[PDB]
Amino acid sequence: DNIQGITKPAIRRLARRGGVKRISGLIYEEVRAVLKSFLESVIRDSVTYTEHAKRKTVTSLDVVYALKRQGRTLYGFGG
DNA sequence: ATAAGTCACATGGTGCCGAGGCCGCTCAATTGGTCGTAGACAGCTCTAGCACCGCTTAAACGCACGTACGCGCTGTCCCCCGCGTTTTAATATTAGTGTATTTGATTTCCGAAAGTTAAAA
């Protein structure tokens, strides 16, 4: 629906940051696959956090929290 | 001439206006003091260590050597992209409503604490 919004030139630019200088196609659609997996996992964690807080605004507190839970502590925004 | 009197003078004092000078109330967390209990300890004994020999022959290392194997080789297939181009959708602006959070006053909630005792190798 909008995973295509993460588009092939955009992931090309990501891969320029990655240091590549040749990239085939199917790389692209599966980069969308891995991004889907990452987003849904962390989103589920933050969602569970807020809904246990009986709130309905998943919040950066719960996002940095879900990230630390996933094992990677994004860092700079409180936390 | 002088007691009465008017008069102006001279000083009194009373009233109001800032204003710079002390003061009053509160909350931080210190430190003062004090109970009661973790902590280090006080004789201690015995654990599994870790040597300390004293064997054996099971691994193991080299001695040989051999296919397997690698590693660039090499025609060539192929694919990625560097752009060039049209698209194309990503800007990033307002917006009010529609809960989302939210912070008061409770107001029950419930388990830590204090008995009392069940159970327990």
Resolution in A: 3.4
Q: Is A56 in contact with A39 (CB distance < 8 Å)?
A: no
What's the number of domains chain A is made of?
A: 1
Could you tell me if A47 and A61 are in contact, meaning their C-beta atoms sit under 8 angstroms apart? no
Q: Which nucleotides of B are covered by protein (CB under 7 A)?
A: 79-82, 89-90, 99-101
CATH number for the domain harbouring residue A41:
1.10.20.10
Domain residues for the domain of A14 are 1-78
Is nucleic acid strand B under 7 Å from A50's C-beta? yes
How far are the Cα atoms of A5, A8, A27, A61 from residue A14, in angstroms, in the given order? Answer: 14, 10, 12, 27
**Count of H-run helices and E-run strands, chain A:** 3, 0
